[PDB]
Design a protein around this ligand. Structure first.
Ligand SMILES: N[C@@H](Cc1ccccc1)C(=O)N[C@@H](Cc1ccc(O)cc1)C(=O)O
Ligand SMILES: N[C@@H](Cc1ccccc1)C(=O)N[C@@H](Cc1ccc(O)cc1)C(=O)O
Lengths: 697, 697
């Protein structure tokens, strides 16, 4: 079924849920801290779920990838080898910034948020500061009890605001990862593709301090005891079976203006894909010369591969469904429908005209902004900018500090500085600085108008770039101890440093704060125009009997449907893959290089009690017509009785353009079957302690 | 069904043919100059069929591609535009070397063939001279009537010889070609692939002189009046329908030794694919800089792309089916079964040992012979060699001249010199000479032992090469009038020439005739062993219950089966594509750039009365489990009642390795539906005169 339904829309999908095959009462799904919705957790960018009473959490391999990479070395490469912890004491810290968010409360605060915005009058910067202040005040009251973290969410262009309260677990440990050749079978070749044969799962465990409250990693921390956890399905999942997903989709753009779509299609997507593909070649080459580079950059290389391929898929999809035609026609129908409404429709029409004006702002600054943006986000420079920015915010009262630099963010900033030790090599950073500066100096002189960067380059050719990278090479911010000292330093110490990375951050900061102020002005203008126009689009959609649900915004959503394949001319994709399809793809070369114990077990038909007689094998991956996006990775797929039948991890090639224009015919979720996850842990990469904990052995 | 069945085997398949759903009688098929089989003709490298009483011939577009190519200029490009001849006199010569072969009779001359070989004795060279003389003599007699061509075919390794007698139609004209965006929709991207949407068809007309004997092109030749022509099906072809193909498959290698397969898989296919891919990049780069280069090298680039992609598919297929293992296990089972046959086993056991020592002769000289072979076959140099060779052979009497340089070959040689005019650009041929010499001068010193070439290079780097290409550019053989002068010149005029390409021909010819003697010796030693070992395999296969049929050898074969898809893990390929599939593949960029009139008709559901209700659209291509190969292109696909339901044109990706090891699971023919052919000639690139002549209007 189409839709990323908010829990508050359960009454509207209760009948469709039952019709599709839900055997739980839709009522049971509305208790978001009960069984089973209470077992679903956010990781920050991925979904996961509790699967034991001792705080075992299951998610995708690609969601645990960062944690696995932080614990990998060139010599002991867990990404390649996998990992198992036989006992609690063998579990590895997932890193200081790993989180498990357990939902405690959702509050509707729409009327209060709208009153705070209106309270600001017709000044856009005051409107942006009013919502900021409201957001900070809600979050401070909601976080007064130790161990909670809150977040204010804007829905439907700012027509609805809800405050989420979560227990924030800060001690997350790695328990199990299959080998990379299972976890990421087919690599970037099979990424965004069906047929699919990827065992995309791993396990964490949540820990708390001995006092029961969240704590950073410590030896005497103990496993979290969740109130609810999911059970692995005892009923074999088959074609046409009801499935549903609860998770944290990040961002969809189905309500974007035609011009926002056109800009993304004609500039953002092709341009990011081009540059990311070129940076990836550079990282791949450096990785072949030094395995330390390969391991330290593995998470970046993985994310950049995923985005670049997703973008190429979205562009193909737009042509497939004529997304440009469909956006143009819908926007024309909404503006014509408003007109026929007379008086009542003039506000939305004026809100449209205003958003329409916001587009053109980036035309001959978009290339510059990209290159300067990427240069400033390289590791040493970005660390210098964050550290200098924090030194400025610390001089203010906490309620006046920029979101991201308040007291409640300090441990996350510090964790980032710590995680950079596992993700930084000077010789690779210099190549990244060189790459983005090179693109900058190749712009026409009109567009290369970053005056600070112009001063530090003192040229617009290869030698000027080499000279600046040589200069920035003298930085000490590669040192973890140096970064942790700067983390506590006052503004004056930054301003006195002869560290060239720090000098660069001090020099660019005034222009950065002015660019941020301009952003907040544009935000404040949108805080009134966006909701008016998006409410009209939603009203129009309801007039046309179309499904109305908010764009994803990193909050909890439910999607449902059935196990089913899809088709193109000449082809029908079947809803399951099987073990034989894994062995049929074997080449012995990355990324089609399965463990020997897998190839041996498939050749012997060792199905380990998990064969589905309807398939004649153990199922590997399955297709369903659910509505997921980035952020849904690791979401539990629940059957009609709320049991775990698999994890969401990807979509088929034709699904990716549904970020902009949903296509029900060729949009499918790809999930890993809970039976394959059990089969891998039995036959290939043994986890006997985990199968016991899951009551599967 | 497996098998390229010779017409004599009709008894054995009579029943399976009927089980499959054949509604005509097998006796009807044994009538080879009758209906329907008498409609089926050979083009030499392609199959075709009579489809009107006025000599109308249908074949594939890629079979007609050379003809279309010859009639194309950078200005008037019929590859891109297509072609239609509304009247007889608008029909374009398909070229001097274009033929239609109509089968007159098959006689077995095995005994006399085995006599000729025996009655030479031991001396390998005498054995091959003997077979050549018996071949020349049997042909000279069979061709005594003015308008016939005869060919001696060796089957099952030389266990069976047959003389084929054909009426040779020498005046073939192009009537109709769709646009290249239809004829070759999907280009080298969709080549060897399903799903497929290619309207791979074109029409020729067979002309003879007013006397009724075949003749070369002349203004007052009239159309041939075939005894038999096929009718286009009125019964709609659907899934599971019986289909059969008659045609001229070129070469299969299912009876090759495990060692011949190992050489092809380990050296020949990888090497050819690599060097062809690099030459194709060059021709693509040159054609983009010069539209005259693009058109003149279109046919060469098309053939090299087809071969390169085919080989990559064969290598991939070998790994899918473990061809290496199956060939080793068969070569080991045959020897074990012969060593249990006692006295009856020993002649085949000795024949194997004799053949097993023709393998270790190449490892050192294979790269050299490839690179020198390719260089010698560039256009100016290749013309120079052939023309000088003919002058050598002219001075001998006819029956002692090399096969291909006889009186009966003069027209084909002269045709080749004329065709070169539309296939030669000096700067491209120099790029080709450069590529291949460059590969030669890259070889280790020990392998670089072509005396004349080392002499002419005087060095072993890019500069020495450029020096020789510079020398050779001085040729006048780029001129057609020059090539026709040399065609009628004697040995001494060649040996007096200061033309550097003629000078190269004369200089290399001694080493060439030496190498050709050591080749005929090679052939001689094999001519008795090969028969004996291949009969043992046939007997072993017959003993195991496995189908026995000879490897393709360019003679007439029948294959049969049913319209059916295939699958692999997670995917079922359905047996038909449809119009909507063509439209869905549209990018507006070559090779997915359909005529506007196609895209307009698809949108508008103008099905032209050609809807299949079961598909809900007009079908485009279909799949079936027939056994075809190179040569079978343009073969009529006949339904249960011997009516034309389409043309064979390609095979799916997994089919191509069946040239060495047949696989019934994933081997399918791809054919163009006769309703797509009509629909194109009605709705898209009209041919109202053809529809009339075919009785479809
Ligand atoms: N494409 C996946 C990540 C991946 C990379 C390589 C190998 C295996 C997986 C991905 O981006 N998944 C999303 C979830 C998602 C996104 C869009 C969609 O249509 C369906 C699923 C994620 O990581 O959250
Ligand atoms: N691959 C085709 C030629 C072609 C190229 C590009 C577009 C369309 C057609 C080809 O080689 N066809 C063969 C017939 C054939 C060969 C092998 C096989 O398994 C099935 C059919 C031919 O030209 O005769």
């Amino acid at each position: 079924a189409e839709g990323m339904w908010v829990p508050q829309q359960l009454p509207e999908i209760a009948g469709p849920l039952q019709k599709a095959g839900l055997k739980l009462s839709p009522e049971q799904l509305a208790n978001l801290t009960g069984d089973p919705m209470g077992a679903v957790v956010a990781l920050g960018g991925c979904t996961a779920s509790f699967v034991s009473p001792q705080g075992l959490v299951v998610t995708n391999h690609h969601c645990a990838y960062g944690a696995i990479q932080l614990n990998s070395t060139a010599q002991k490469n867990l990404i390649k080898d996998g990992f198992n912890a036989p006992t609690l004491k063998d579990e590895l810290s997932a890193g200081p910034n790993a989180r498990v968010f357990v939902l405690d409360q959702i509050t509707d605060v729409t009327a209060q948020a709208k009153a705070a915005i209106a309270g600001a009058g017709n000044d856009p910067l005051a409107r942006s500061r009013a919502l900021d202040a409201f957001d900070k005040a809600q979050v401070a009251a909601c976080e007064a009890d130790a161990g909670f973290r809150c977040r204010l969410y804007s829905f439907s262009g700012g027509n609805t605001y809800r405050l989420f309260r979560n227990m924030e677990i800060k001690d997350v440990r790695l328990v199990y990862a299959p080998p990379g050749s299972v976890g990421k079978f087919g690599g970037d070749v099979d990424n965004w593709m069906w047929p699919r044969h990827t065992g995309d799962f791993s396990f964490y465990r949540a820990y708390v301090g001995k006092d029961g409250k969240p704590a950073a990693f410590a030896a005497d921390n103990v496993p979290y005891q969740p109130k609810h956890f999911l059970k692995f399905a005892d009923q074999p999942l088959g074609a046409d079976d009801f499935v549903m997903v609860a998770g944290y989709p990040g961002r969809t753009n189905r309500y974007a203006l035609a011009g926002e779509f056109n800009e993304t299609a004609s500039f953002t997507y092709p341009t990011i894909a081009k540059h990311y593909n070129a940076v990836l070649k550079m990282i791949a080459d450096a990785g072949k010369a030094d395995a330390d580079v390969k391991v330290k950059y593995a998470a970046t290389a993985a994310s950049m591969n995923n985005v670049a391929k997703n973008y190429l898929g979205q562009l193909e999809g737009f042509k497939r469904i004529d997304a440009a035609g469909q956006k143009q026609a819908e926007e024309a129908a909404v503006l014509a429908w408003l007109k026929k409404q007379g008086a009542a429709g003039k506000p939305a029409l004026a809100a449209h005209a205003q958003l329409l004006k916001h587009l053109d702002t980036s035309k001959s600054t978009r290339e510059r902004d990209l290159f300067v943006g990427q240069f400033n986000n390289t590791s040493a420079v970005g660390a210098a900018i964050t550290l200098y920015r924090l030194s400025i915010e610390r001089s203010k009262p906490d309620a006046e500090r920029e979101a991201g630099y308040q007291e409640r963010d300090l441990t996350t900033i510090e964790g980032g500085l710590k995680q950079m030790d596992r993700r930084y090599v000077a010789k690779m950073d210099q190549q990244l600085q060189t790459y983005w500066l090179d693109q900058y100096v190749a712009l026409p002189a009109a567009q290369r108008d970053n005056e600070v960067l112009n001063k530090w380059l003192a040229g617009s050719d290869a030698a000027a770039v080499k000279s600046l990278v040589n200069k920035l090479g003298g930085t000490e911010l590669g040192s973890l101890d140096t970064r942790l000292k700067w983390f506590k330093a006052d503004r004056a110490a930054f301003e006195a440093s002869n560290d060239p990375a720090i000098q660069y951050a001090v020099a660019v900061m005034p222009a950065l704060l002015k660019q941020e102020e301009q952003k907040k002005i544009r935000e404040g203008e949108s805080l009134t125009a966006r909701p008016l126009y998006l409410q009209a689009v939603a009203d129009y959609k309801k007039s046309q009997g179309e499904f109305v649900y908010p764009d994803a915004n990193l909050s909890l959503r439910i999607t449902f449907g059935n196990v089913m394949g899809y088709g193109k001319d000449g082809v029908k994709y079947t809803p399951f893959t099987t073990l034989e399809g894994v062995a049929a793809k074997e080449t012995g070369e990355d990324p089609f290089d399965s463990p020997k114990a897998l190839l041996d077990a498939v050749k012997a038909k060792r199905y380990g009690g998990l064969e589905d007689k309807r398939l004649g094998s153990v199922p590997v991956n399955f297709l369903s017509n659910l509505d997921i996006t980035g952020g849904n990775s690791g979401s539990p797929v629940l059957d009609a009785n709320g049991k775990l039948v698999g994890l969401a991890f990807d979509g088929n090639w034709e699904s990716v353009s549904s970020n902009w224009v949903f296509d029900p015919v060729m949009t499918r979720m790809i999930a890993v079957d809970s039976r394959y996850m059990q089969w891998i842990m039995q036959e290939v990469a043994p986890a006997p302690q985990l199968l016991k904990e899951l009551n599967l052995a």
